[PDB]
């Protein structure tokens, strides 16, 4: 991802990663996914009474902070959005659709993610 940084100035050192990507962002993706499969198993389990609880559609905003402050977290979140769109789960989709509005380097608004 830092390739243009290596051509702009001759940078031959490795770019560094984020810790909260490892401990907050990607575990937040995995947070949303395992709750997703939990309400799926609950739907596939009988005996749900009137007025069931929807999937939590609240958004942890440190996730969006990493989207809008880290290009790597940005683009991997974009491809996560595309993958869940291929899975087409409306609940998580509109859960994470806020916060994608403000994202790093307009990557959510770039050619790649928009085309996909």
């Amino acid at each position: 991802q830092g390739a243009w940084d290596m051509i702009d100035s001759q940078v031959f050192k490795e770019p560094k990663m984020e810790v909260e990507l490892i401990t907050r962002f990607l575990p937040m993706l995995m947070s949303f996914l395992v709750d997703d499969y939990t309400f799926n198993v609950d739907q596939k389990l009988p005996a749900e009474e009137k007025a069931p609880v929807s999937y939590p559609n609240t958004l942890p905003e440190s996730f969006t902070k990493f989207l809008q402050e880290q290009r790597m977290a940005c683009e991997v979140g974009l491809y996560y959005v595309l993958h869940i769109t291929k899975q087409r789960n409306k609940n998580a989709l509109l859960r994470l659709l806020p916060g994608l509005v403000e994202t790093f380097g307009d990557l959510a608004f770039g050619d790649i993610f928009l085309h996909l």
């Binding site: 947070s31 395992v34 939990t38 198993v41």
Partner: peptide, 12 residues
């Protein structure tokens, strides 16, 4: 920790 409790909640 949240993740592991959601894991164990899905097992149930």
């Amino acid at each position: 920790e949240a993740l592991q409790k959601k894991f164990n909640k899905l097992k149930k």
